[PDB]
Chain length 113, copies 8
């Protein structure tokens, strides 16, 4: 139930306070931004790379402090990846998925990892 940024770009309200994580989030917004303009293989691949890399890195930082809610978080990550690997062109869904994942799921680890 959060606003979908237009243009679809990362903004400080999505800040987790983990500099590296925030920078990775910036890439995810950009990847979706282009996918909305030109929904092709190249743009999907850019997003897919940045997404797989971010999710893995974020998982590693969560594991570094044995984050209590890692298991549920990882399943969320898997659902988005699955959606990108069986891409049906729903850019609006992806836009809202990333917004909600960061503000509701990623925010849960604030001060815990």
């Amino acid at each position: 139930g959060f606003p979908i940024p237009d243009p679809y770009v990362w903004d400080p309200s999505f800040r987790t306070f983990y500099s590296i994580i925030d920078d990775e989030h910036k890439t995810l917004f950009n990847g979706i931004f282009h996918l909305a303009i030109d929904d092709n293989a190249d743009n999907l691949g850019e997003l897919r790379r940045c997404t797989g890399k971010h999710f893995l890195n974020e998982q590693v930082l969560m594991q570094a402090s044995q984050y209590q809610f890692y298991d549920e978080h990882k399943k969320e990550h898997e659902t988005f990846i699955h959606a990108l690997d069986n891409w049906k062109g729903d850019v609006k869904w992806a836009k809202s998925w990333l917004v909600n994942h960061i503000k509701t799921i990623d925010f849960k680890y604030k001060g815990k990892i």
Copy 2:
């Protein structure tokens, strides 16, 4: 059967002689100290992060030398984490758990990792 420090702060008698481990132990004492003053979600979270991170790191150092009693040690770690993840406000228990874990369990790896 060891005395519970008052104020609850790390002291040299808890020294394992592994500088990094000793520095991480200092954070667990500080975490329980505040939890005892204000037993809220923020302080539990600080203790939780430091505890999850310390246990993981300490486990990595033990596995680096294939510590003989790694398994039983890891089981102790799991018990405290589980207690913190199902916190019922028994600070006195946590205070004694940490003191005893370090002096009886952690001290077992002295010179072995």
Copy 3:
């Protein structure tokens, strides 16, 4: 002479083919994007952090293969940092500086680092 993206966001034409670098570049465009909306300390600070980090990381990568034109490149980096640290509110110049630095200066290290 290169067109200035509007909205000011990274796009594939800026690709250096170095995954890490391209992702860091996406963060610089986003930094300038918000600076253009609200020219305040927080927005400049975000850009300043990402810029300082990216330039250093890029320099380290260039140094890793003893990049031939490292010195000239470093001097360019210093100028942007200096501008950011003696900020006068010229967002138009910053937008132009980044676009031209990546496409003429960064592109020069393609296949050399």
Copy 4:
């Protein structure tokens, strides 16, 4: 101007939001805590090690994003190290130095490294 903690221990108001930094800061408070009780070589050594390590690590993190006020910060660090290396037993000064260094100098790098 800030209150000197009693007992002299780290607390959440000193939070910089960098987990490694906050954890290292906890070790410095503890180091000074014991110095005040027993002003001896061993207690000074513990603080000296934790202080030398923390300052170096924090400096490296500031350098990682080419922190704008690194030089002034480094000069502050050298002043404290110098006092520790030419110790005259002024624990009251040390207690105040650390409190003020974190809240006025360290707090300056928030969101920039």
Copy 5:
């Protein structure tokens, strides 16, 4: 169906644009090159080591971005390692296996890792 280089050495048409991967690929060509001249134990071992190392490293980089087609790729890697470990002297097969693997299988991860 690609041409088998003669002499059997790495050339720019095999470029993946990942510097470290391309440099490891150069060692595989050199390995097969000598096995073709003197199909003995020492040359098989040199190739085996560089192949074992490259496949592992490439696999790590693929996992770094959770490469979508990692499983089928690892199965390919396994097939060649299996061949090298039960070596019967079919140099011509090894020559075409490497050429085809890089150009059809490795090329699939371009821009994805």
Copy 6:
């Protein structure tokens, strides 16, 4: 069937040509050397630490090039660790076990890792 050095110390005939491995092997001879003079808990602990660490490190290097005979090698390592963790005082057996392990089992990975 190799000679058992007397004094029990590492010598160049044990060289694998991997500087770090050779250095770790030197610690193993020294550990057994003292265990022969004073077969106590401290000396067994020293050897055990260096042994667990060397075996893990050596296993990591073997895995780095997916060493062909890793499995059988690891089984040998486990046998010596098991003997140290269920120590019955057979110093002569440990002396010959190490000498033979390096010269017949470790030597197998020469040029392959």
Copy 7:
């Protein structure tokens, strides 16, 4: 005085017994191989990248054990880099320089790093 490989490719007689180094050397031979066929910017770039990286990595390894003849070695590296950066098309000189650098200069660090 050493024979110049033809085709110009690395061979076991150039082995230093350092896995990483030898693998890097293989890239240098391949780089000069193509330069000899087509003396252009891309081929010189590929060799320049690999040469800069190798020389740096080798220097780091030499420094790791504080190699006694590091200075004389570094000077030789600078001479080759200088040549590549002020390229005049003398592929024959480059072929001979690399062969002789490895067999007379690199071989000097055998067993010392």
Copy 8:
């Protein structure tokens, strides 16, 4: 003043309580042990590599906590390296130098790094 071990081998009395350091110290005793038997280039080089690496590594550990007596310690290291690089065969001096360096100079950093 300290007794020179015979056989010249590391023993527990030389313990600094830093695992890595202690293991590296074991390689230095072994290096000198063989030099005393056969004072040749191969034995001097083994010791030299080990000594150079140990000294550098120990210096890196000292610097990590900005060890207070780092300069005086580095000067000692250089003294020994110089002797090894201008070797005149005084094994007796070398045996005494290492023993005294560890027990008087190295011991000074106990609990400080």
